[PDB]
A paper describes a structure:
The receptor binding domain (RBD) of the spike (S) protein binds to its host receptor, angiotensin-converting enzyme 2 (ACE2), facilitating virus entry. In our study, we investigated the binding affinities of raccoon dog ACE2 (rdACE2) to the spike (S) protein receptor binding domain (RBD) of SARS-CoV-2 prototype (PT) and its variants. To elucidate the molecular basis of rdACE2 binding to SARS-CoV-2 PT and Alpha RBDs, respectively, we obtained cryo-EM rdACE2/S complex structures. The cryo-EM structures of rdACE2 bound to SARS-CoV-2 PT or Alpha S proteins were determined at 2.52 Å and 2.86 Å, respectively.
To obtain a high-resolution view of the RBD/ACE2 interface, local refinement was performed, resulting in the determination of the PT RBD/rdACE2 and Alpha S RBD/rdACE2 structures at 2.64 Å and 3.16 Å, respectively. Similarly, in the Alpha S/rdACE2 complex, two RBDs were present, but only one up-RBD was observed to bind to rdACE2. As previously reported, the interacting residues of the RBD can be divided into two patches. In patch 1 of both PT and Alpha RBD, S477 and N487 form hydrogen bonds (H-bonds) with Q18 and Y83, respectively. K417 of RBD forms a salt bridge with E30 of rdACE2. In PT RBD, Q493 in patch 1 binds to Y34 of the rdACE2, whereas in Alpha RBD, Q493 forms an H-bond contact with E35. Moving to patch 2, T500 and N501 of both PT and Alpha RBD form H-bonds with Y41 of rdACE2, while G502 of these two RBDs forms an H-bond with R353 of rdACE2. Furthermore, in PT RBD, Y449 forms an H-bond contact with E38 and Q42 of rdACE2. Conversely, in Alpha RBD, Y449 forms an additional H-bond with R353 of rdACE2. The results indicate that PT, Alpha and Delta variants exhibit comparable binding affinities to rdACE2.
Residue numbers in the entry:
A (entry chain B): 335 to 528
B (entry chain A): 19 to 133, 142 to 615
Write the structure that this text describes.
Amino acid sequence: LCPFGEVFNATRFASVYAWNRKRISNCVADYSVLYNSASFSTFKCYGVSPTKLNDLCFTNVYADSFVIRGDEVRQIAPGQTGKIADYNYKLPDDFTGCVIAWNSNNLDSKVGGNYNYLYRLFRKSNLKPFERDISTEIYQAGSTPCNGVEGFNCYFPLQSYGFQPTYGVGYQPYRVVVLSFELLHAPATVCGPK
Amino acid sequence: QSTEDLVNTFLEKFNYEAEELSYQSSLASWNYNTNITDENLQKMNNAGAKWSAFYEEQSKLAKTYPLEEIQDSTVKRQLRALQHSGSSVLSADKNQRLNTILNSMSTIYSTGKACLLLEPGLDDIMENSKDYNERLWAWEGWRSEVGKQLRPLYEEYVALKNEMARANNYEDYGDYWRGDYEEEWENGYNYSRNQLIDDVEHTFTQIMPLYQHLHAYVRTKLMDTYPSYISPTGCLPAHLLGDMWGRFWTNLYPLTVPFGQKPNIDVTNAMVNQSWDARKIFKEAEKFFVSVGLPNMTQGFWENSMLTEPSDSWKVVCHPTAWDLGRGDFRIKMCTKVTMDDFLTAHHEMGHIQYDMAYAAQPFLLRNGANEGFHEAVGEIMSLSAATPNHLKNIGLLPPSFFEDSETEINFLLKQALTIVGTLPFTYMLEKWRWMVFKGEIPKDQWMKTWWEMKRNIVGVVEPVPHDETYCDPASLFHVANDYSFIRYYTRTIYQFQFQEALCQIAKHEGPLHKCDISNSSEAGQKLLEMLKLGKSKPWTYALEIVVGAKNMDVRPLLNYFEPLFTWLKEQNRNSFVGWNTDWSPYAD
Ligand SMILES: *[C@@H]1O[C@H](CO)[C@@H](O[C@@H]2O[C@H](CO)[C@@H](O)[C@H](O)[C@H]2NC(C)=O)[C@H](O)[C@H]1NC(C)=O
Ligand SMILES: *[C@@H]1O[C@H](CO)[C@@H](O[C@@H]2O[C@H](CO)[C@@H](O)[C@H](O)[C@H]2NC(C)=O)[C@H](O)[C@H]1NC(C)=O
Ligand SMILES: *[C@@H]1O[C@H](CO)[C@@H](O[C@@H]2O[C@H](CO)[C@@H](O)[C@H](O)[C@H]2NC(C)=O)[C@H](O)[C@H]1NC(C)=O
Ligand SMILES: *[C@@H]1O[C@H](CO)[C@@H](O[C@@H]2O[C@H](CO)[C@@H](O)[C@H](O)[C@H]2NC(C)=O)[C@H](O)[C@H]1NC(C)=O
Ligand SMILES: *[C@@H]1O[C@H](CO)[C@@H](O)[C@H](O)[C@H]1NC(C)=O
Ligand SMILES: [Zn+2]
């Protein structure tokens, strides 16, 4: 009987680049309370339908929770391209799991400008599936490198969203949680009756 | 490693670092206009200074990239927009002097005093008073007091502006202004600056006949007030033009009305009967804009916008404006009332808001109009289409038994003509004088002797009192005392009718053009949003050709709009003389 609730309604969510990982094992699964939330803008489950959840269950489940914009929600999907889908968080082509997002403008805004959420816009190459990098090295653009400190033709690789209450709809903050399964040799434990 | 590679990275940082410093300045400016206090001014000034400093730093540091190697089309023009800005870099010592001169030149106009300040009392005499003597002294006095102190300051202004223009490999300061229409493309969509002088000089000949007729009636309808004071074959004096300088003729309507027994189309009483309010007006405007296939208004529009007088004793200006603060923020600010006049402004501002929403997907540097006239021209056709009898009857504010009379149409056409057609010779003359002066061809010692020489020859307005070279007439205008382009209106006037003819043709309306309507048509709006979404990503020749199908301005649509008025007026000139003579003087008969 693992508490799926606290994963969703947690106090603070992390930046996109430092995407948190939660591991859940040796418990039961309760998907009714997630379905009856009535506050999910996107509920796209890929390879997931409540019809056949009662015959096959998995061993361990991983959860990822972060905060993104409103127009970047469509980029959390297999094969999508853009900025967040190749520099921050990529879903493998053979992905079996669920993505849930909801609006959370009422909690993460300030009239003076919230500056505690960051995203990365430059890199040397695309990120491998389920790969992370929190490197603070100054990104290099030109052929000639700069001596560890930026200025001309050198750029810091992180930029912050200035969330404010009176933005549009595609710029309002959104909270996203992704659930994925694993099929290793551990005993299949996460599945419940009724 | 190519130059394009560095350019792309440099631009992708700017596109996001400008969006905050613009938003902060927009919010600071909006809060002051909304609340007006003694403390918001400092915040607004700080935000503006920060944004200006950031822009000036980026524009200077972006000049190390040569333009010759750029291959992509839009990427080159983004840097063209970024680099040309900040061209006012000639000398640090001279910059302070120029700024002080500009501020001093602007100061006297703001603090002008004449026995009554310009806005409260001085405007009323020129706009409503019908006394000959009262205007006769006032028109001279306004130039004598305020103007004479502005003449010596304006001498160095033209020289400094010419030096600034020559700094950037231009010819004269006029050519610097003429660069808002210059574009470079393939053989079919290229525009050169020196053609703009010629094209306008064409589009004024074809309007020459009609204007002449408009010069006749009024001349024979102003005879009654002054029987033996002005000659019946000469130029109209300036002080009897219904305005201080003569920009609009719209206040001569009570003096020259053909049929005063038929009231104009007014629905204010019907609105009063049904107890309308601001929200009803704006919902009606939203219905009008959504019926033509355009999208609707976002949720925050009704919550963040100010749409009425604040009656809590706080001071506001609330001059009608529409704001696109940035990043999904759209607001409209206007003191709403319960008269018919605000019904047109409701559509006029919504047009600007829709045009702003259209191009939000373009990069930051491309979020504007095609040129300096498209943005305002888009919002006039909505007011034109929302003031027709058919729309008023369809909405419900008008009884179904109402009919249309020929005299009503003639009076409406004359009322619109006195506002639109009468402002074209003045607008053309002012720009012609300024361009010639900036070129320096006109001798400095005969400026007045040249200026009035134009007035008789082009617009046919004669001064009441002879003047020497001490005076400086053009400085009397607000747009001249401050550095501002004056050629926008000439283009906008033609563009609005150019668009209206095509849209009405696509809507398949049968009858004369002035009785058109574009409601209940999802095709015209769909075609319009095809160009509105472009923004500045393509030159304005493509934007024009997408809708009308041509590449240059044509004044034929404007002549087709006023065909009934022209034909009906043509009969009244048979027992009259049309034209003016440059032979009469105020001092000698
Ligand atoms: C996460 O925490 C919130 C805390 O408010 C839970 O919200 C409650 O939802 C139930 C219905 O599911 C209501 O009856 C309660 O009144 C709500 N608030 C309270 C006081 O708990 C939410 O249900 C939790 N998450 C999940 C998935 O159950
Ligand atoms: C747009 O490009 C055309 C290209 O042909 C320019 O046409 C020039 O016209 C002059 C005058 O006859 C010729 O001497 C040139 O040889 C033509 N070609 C070029 C490349 O200059 C035209 O002047 C350009 N500008 C406009 C406003 O049409
Ligand atoms: C709105 O228009 C109606 C049109 O009839 C007005 O109605 C009459 O008003 C007078 C008083 O002003 C009453 O004595 C009559 O009985 C009303 N009805 C009729 C049939 O004449 C009405 O007053 C106007 N104003 C409002 C706000 O209702
Ligand atoms: C634009 O947004 C408005 C709401 O701001 C939409 O209006 C609603 O449309 C639905 C259509 O079924 C009606 O049931 C509602 O009563 C309307 N009003 C409200 C207050 O919700 C409008 O339809 C949207 N766009 C269009 C196509 O006009
Ligand atoms: C504007 O500022 C004053 C002073 O702080 C405040 O009382 C008022 O509520 C604000 N807003 C309005 C609607 O005037
Ligand atoms: Zn406008």
